[PDB]
Amino acid sequence: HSIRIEGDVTLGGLFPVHAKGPSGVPCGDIKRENGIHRLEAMLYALDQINSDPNLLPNVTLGARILDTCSRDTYALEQSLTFVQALIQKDTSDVRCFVKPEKVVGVIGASGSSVSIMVANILRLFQIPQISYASTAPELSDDRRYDFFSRVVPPDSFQAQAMVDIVKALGWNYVSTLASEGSYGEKGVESFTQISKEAGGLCIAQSVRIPQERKDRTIDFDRIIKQLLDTPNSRAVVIFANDEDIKQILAAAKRADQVGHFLWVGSDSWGSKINPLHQHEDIAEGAITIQPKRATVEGFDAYFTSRTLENNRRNVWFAEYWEENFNCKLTISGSKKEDTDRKCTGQERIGKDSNYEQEGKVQFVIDAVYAMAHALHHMNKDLCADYRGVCPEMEQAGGKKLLKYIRNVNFNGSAGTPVMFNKNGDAPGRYDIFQYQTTNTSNPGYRLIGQWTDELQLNIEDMQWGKGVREIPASVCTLPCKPGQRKKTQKGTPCCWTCEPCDGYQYQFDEMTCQHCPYDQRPNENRTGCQDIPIIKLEWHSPWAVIPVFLAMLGIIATIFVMATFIRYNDTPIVRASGRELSYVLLTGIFLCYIITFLMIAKPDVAVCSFRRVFLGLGMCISYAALLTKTNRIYRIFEQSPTSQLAITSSLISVQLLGVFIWFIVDPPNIIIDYDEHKTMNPEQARGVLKCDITDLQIICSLGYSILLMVTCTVYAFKTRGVPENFNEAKYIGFTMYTTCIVWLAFIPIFFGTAQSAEKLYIQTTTLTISMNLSASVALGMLYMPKVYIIIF
Template sequence: LLLSEVVHGQEMYAPHSIRLEGDITLGGLFPVHAKGPPGVPCGDIKKENGIHRLEAMLYALDQINSDPDLLPNVTLGARILDTCSRDTYALEQSLTFVQALIQKDTSDVRCTNGEPPVFVKPEKVVGVIGASGSSVSIMVANILRLFQIPQISYASTAPELSDDRRYDFFSRVVPPDSFQAQAMVDIVKALGWNYVSTLASEGNYGEKGVESFMQISREAGRQIPPSPRRRGGLDSVTSGGPCQPLRLLLCFLHRQILAAAKRADQVGHFLWVGSDTWGSKVSPLLQQEDVAEGAITILPKRATIEGFDTYFTSRTLENNRRNVWFAEYWEENFNCKLTISGSKKEKKPLCRGGQERIGKDSPYEQEGKVQFVIDAVYAMAHALHHMNKDLCADYPGVCPEMEHAGGKRLLKYIRGVNFNGQGAVGTQCPLNVRRSCCGVRVKEPWSRLPREALESPLERFQEHLDLFLCHLQEWGGGVRQVPPSVCSLPCKPGERKKMVKGMPCCWHCELCDGYQYQADEVTCLLCSYNQRPNENRTGCRAIPIAKLGWGLISVQLLGVLVWFAVDPPNIVVDYDEQKTLNPEQARGVLKCDITDLQIICSLGYSILLMVTCTVYAIKTRGVPENFNEAKPIGFTMYTTCIVWLAFIPIFFGTAQSAEKV
């Protein structure tokens, strides 16, 4: 019965907001629910990004209201709304904050008895804590500035929100994405990576974060051209592509990309540099450890608030009636069902009468932005405290002058806030809502080690990044050397680079073929007419001269030597051939002592080669034209045979004839 009364009281009190009475009311915007399907503004409850952050504001208000030195005699109240992670819905909800500032003409409104109605004036919201997503903060900031209501965000990091001309009433306690982008550029530079691929989620957070990275890369003079933003879903990103040597993926993106990489069987291939959506918690990486191993994550410099852990784990349905969404959180967190109407209809066991305990009966890990929510509330409280001291020095509580001071005056105090925030405990790092000088921190490559091993920072970052590269001792798969990430691997010797248009770090390797050699990285040239490329085609060398070998002539040489041994050459002087009638003109002719048979034998070997070549030329005449050398060889041999057939009878027929002049 008690459980039903508690839950019923939460539902009937205010189904869409939390209202806490106080002398000064602060607004709050939190993504208690996710986006709903088309046509439905809100979806499932967000246990961590929603409830943890919302409870952090309630915790901070409790701490401030119990602090005798901060806003003494003043109680802070709150009006907290759910943005449902949707900018348009958040805009509608934020109209609640400006109701008290809208003048309504009720002169013509009368009750049924003719009396003028009595309107309950809505509470005046002096400042707003939120929102979470950058796109939501941008939408809300546009309406809050019209009514001069200051706004302090605890999680919106889009760089464009730093524009004081457009968002002059917006402040934040987290560093902008340009800090993360600067850290990413320094990481890429320090580790020698010359090509990265960027992944961005839709919206201001992802797209503007990548734009900041690209802009800072260009300003730093670094040739780190990110590839075009990948489209076609997460699976298309991890399915490989023409740049297989590319390994580094720079992500302003949710961690569902890890599951896509696992589905594509790319475990161990990619290097991840993730923004603050990656490094804030370890639990979302469960079952994805092998894919995430070696990832470098970037976080706003933060600390775990132990007091909040004690506070939150002690929350129950009985002692937390002020949170109208806590019953829904209870069902989701403990995977049980409360015995009330309107709860979800899934097949869940009944809750144990509210006896469950957070952290004991369910896992608990403090959400990463809790500290910043607390810092944002404290920043607003410090500004109100200084404003109260200046305007109400001799007045206990909120004086009329402070009540009518307006948001523009409060904004000046907010911009002047400078205190040690919750994340700066034990450090010399005062908080400034415009700059958040503590900056960001980079966590070492993620490994499957105990939790405490994941927390050692690689750097200290305020104006620039000082990397402690000695911490980079092990990457994914036990690799100890910094893995490369390039668009294209270096070309081999003898290959030239064919550059990809518009991408100076990308090229295709083409072999210098034929008589070409590699003159430089991008040029192939022809060798001179008497040279050819060397073995690796990096230069030229002389073409060797073909000389008569000892193959075919060895048989002929052997026959000649045998012939010389059996019948050594000899000469004779023929006096008869040139014996003329005139004795003065008679001459002896020096001749080889050889017979006609011996001449035929000496020519027989050549005739044998000639006949053999002719026969093979005839047999190969049907070979395809591109490989057919038989036709010209055959024509040559046919001609040679005809000449020889004519030579032999002529030679022997005229050998005995005598020419007389």
């Protein structure tokens, strides 16, 4: 029996005052407390709306309440009862006539499945449906339901809140857990759909909860085991009902896992004490969500002063008293044989029954208020100049009503405002609940913060607050970001194996490692190929000390030969020998010493522009004096110092044009370091550098001295045959042979020495030492006669 309330404009209503237990009858005799505390709230909303001059003063608001106990056909019949009165043809049925009233909207669609079947027929006609307890989010689309407007946030808003609360609580990967055959399946579907597009959110595992058999608990023991298999995964979200939540918490308690993964609950969990009993370990960290549960004091005041004499508008309240503590009614029905006590005489038993106003009770008042405000907007925009209700409502459509319902931003029964989005869904106003036992001993769900559009919570709400909100934030392994890594992702999502790249490549923005140009290598941090000044060959103690001393020892010999050269012109010993020969030998020795000392300085662009010819000029100057001496002793031995100087200048000019030619080949530059070793902590390795000097160039430069030495030896072979002039020719021949032997040993040091990376600091030093030894031997052999003459 439906509820008829007189009024110019009436609203529909679908409220489940019965149950769908027995499948034979359409609705069971038993009633539900949640389904009976909502239609009375709608009646109160209506009789308070048509009572004040600020809301529909000129028109009264009627009601049309029908029962729908979540049936596929009976609820469908009651929903079709609304549009039957709109047409009201009834031309075929004749009995031997009534005044029908159209409905502007419905405040029904309580059950999740009833909403779809009601809106499907309500979409065809121009009558919207304002649901209040719908949970299934698949009806949030406008292409399939354009005449639907939810006053409660769908499960998609819950999934968005979960995403926002996981992104803002450290960890990024979470193992989801939901149960099929209920709102949990759609909830986890929306969660995955919104996490795939979300950036920075990861899914660790997805497991289903079977609701076929739960008493054996053989599945829950296996679920908690495979959840612990994955490493460092401590975040789990639950979208199932409380029934299996109790069992899974009991299983986690009896198992006593070493992982101690924190739980994340849904609106089903909320802030109830039923699932957990004396469970402190499993409850720690159980951060759970729950929408705003407001209380309307007006509804409580109206629901206490109820009697069987004044509440005659509804027909189900007469038989509603049968759901009390074993009491019935005898005015209309027959008393049961089990109990004969009557509870009609007093209503204090209802107060003693400890009833509580459900959270969904205030969700039917704001819907009626929103439709009343839409009708008020209609009246103000269409017929604001009429005494009562205007005739422009019967000939109107549902499109304008939907448009007026969409832009509704008024404050509902409680202090929170109610509004509708473009898809007819109210914004999610959720409250974050976390269980804590350290700060307080009694069981509590102390609120963290509110979730309306952003995150306004307390990060330091927990007593510890040190790192417990960061322990499940991982990259599928230990956090690896010390400055040398390589993020390579293959197969596994949002994770990469902690492995470094090669030592010859440095990372760039922690993404990839690439190779820098030559003479550069990554540092100890593998972040960039830094630049460092090259090494120098000046003041080397371990090895260069001996050649440095050998080169410095020649200064005294050069100073003694220079002073003795232009001096003692009276004695005939120096007059018999060529005066220019001694000067040429001294100049050659000085040039050789300068060339040996030039290797200490670091070569540059301008240094080897003049140092590339100083080494070659020194070797050729020394051999000129010996050639002049052999020419003189050959001219004197038969059966010219002027021509000797010209020959020496021509030999030097042949070397000058030559070095100019081999220098005009390439501009004077610096060569890069040559090495093939690994990279160590001192990034500034032994970067020895020089100008364009190689083995072929050195061989071409020393080739001219080889022929001169060969000619000197060939001349000395015959000069030593005839001994004369105090065996001076024999001494010259011995000196030439010693010089040739020293030059022969130098060629073997520079040949085949390819098994040493320090050749630039060994072979050049050995060659300089050999040249200095030859020059010193020549100077000692030449200055011996002058010393003997000075002594005697």
